[PDB]
Curated annotation (Swiss-Prot):
It comes from the Eukaryota. It comes from Homo sapiens (Human). Phosphorylation by CK2 disrupt the intramolecular binding between the bromo domain 2 and the NPS region and promotes binding between the NPS and the BID regions, leading to activate the protein and promote binding to acetylated histones. In absence of phosphorylation, BRD4 does not localize to p53/TP53 target gene promoters, phosphorylation promoting recruitment to p53/TP53 target promoters. Ubiquitously expressed. Residues 17-123 form the Bromo domain. JQ1, a thieno-triazolo-1,4-diazepine derivative, and I-BET, a benzodiazepine derivative, have been tested on tumors with success. Treatment with GSK1210151A (I-BET151, a I-BET derivative) has strong effets on mixed lineage leukemia and promotes myeloid differentiation and leukemia stem-cell depletion. It is linked to Cornelia de Lange syndrome 6: A form of Cornelia de Lange syndrome, a clinically heterogeneous developmental disorder associated with malformations affecting multiple systems. It is characterized by facial dysmorphisms, abnormal hands and feet, growth delay, cognitive retardation, hirsutism, gastroesophageal dysfunction and cardiac, ophthalmologic and genitourinary anomalies. CDLS6 inheritance is autosomal dominant. There is a cross-link at K58 (Glycyl lysine isopeptide (Lys-Gly) (interchain with G-Cter in SUMO2)). This is Bromodomain-containing protein 4. The record marks N99 as: Acetylated histone binding. It is found in: Nucleus; Chromosome. Interacts with p53/TP53; the interaction is direct. Interacts (via CTD region) with CDK9 and CCNT1, acting as an associated component of P-TEFb complex. Interacts with RELA (when acetylated at 'Lys-310'). Interacts (via NET domain) with NSD3, CHD4, BICRA and ATAD5. The interaction with BICRA bridges BRD4 to the GBAF complex. Interacts (via NET domain) with JMJD6 (via JmjC and N-terminal domains); the interaction is stronger in presence of ssRNA and recruits JMJD6 on distal enhancers. Interacts with NSD3. Interacts with NIPBL. Signal peptide: none annotated. The NET domain mediates interaction with a number of chromatin proteins involved in transcription regulation (NSD3, JMJD6, CHD4, GLTSCR1 and ATAD5).
């Protein structure tokens, strides 16, 4: 079984804007998570072929990862901050759905989610 194509990261047919919250999601949220000791498994799409996990994309129909989110933010793919927050939420939920609770990857995802929630609880004000 092949990997699926990665999620779309640009689209010239959508209007674009810079906002306080979107800037914060890249400059603070993404950048801070990216530096975490346990960020590496979440920095790019899950390579189910190399991991020999052909059931990964049988189970996970909405893949998401921080590499994709980073590109989306850089490419102004999101109009609303919540679209980006939803992508982070999806990334964590995918990990929890697919993996066994005792797996290191879940411990890692949970550590990142803790940091994520700390950062989004300090989201700046909307225009
Ligand atoms: C490299 N990241 C991985 C690898 N395997 N699985 C099952 C995952 O959920 C993740 Cl995030």
């Amino acid at each position: 079984s092949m990997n699926p194509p990665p999620p779309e990261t640009s689209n010239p047919n959508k209007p674009k804007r810079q906002t306080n919250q979107l800037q914060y999601l890249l400059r603070v949220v993404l950048k801070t998570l990216w530096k975490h000791q346990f960020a590496w498994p979440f920095q790019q799409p899950v390579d189910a072929v190399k991991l020999n996990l052909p059931d990964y994309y049988k189970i996970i129909k909405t893949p998401m990862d921080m590499g994709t989110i980073k590109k989306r933010l850089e490419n102004n793919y999101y109009w609303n901050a919540q679209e980006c927050i939803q992508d982070f939420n999806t990334m964590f939920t995918n990990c929890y759905i697919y993996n066994k609770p005792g797996d290191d990857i879940v411990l890692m995802a949970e550590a990142l989610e803790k940091l994520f929630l700390q950062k989004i609880n300090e989201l700046p004000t909307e225009e």
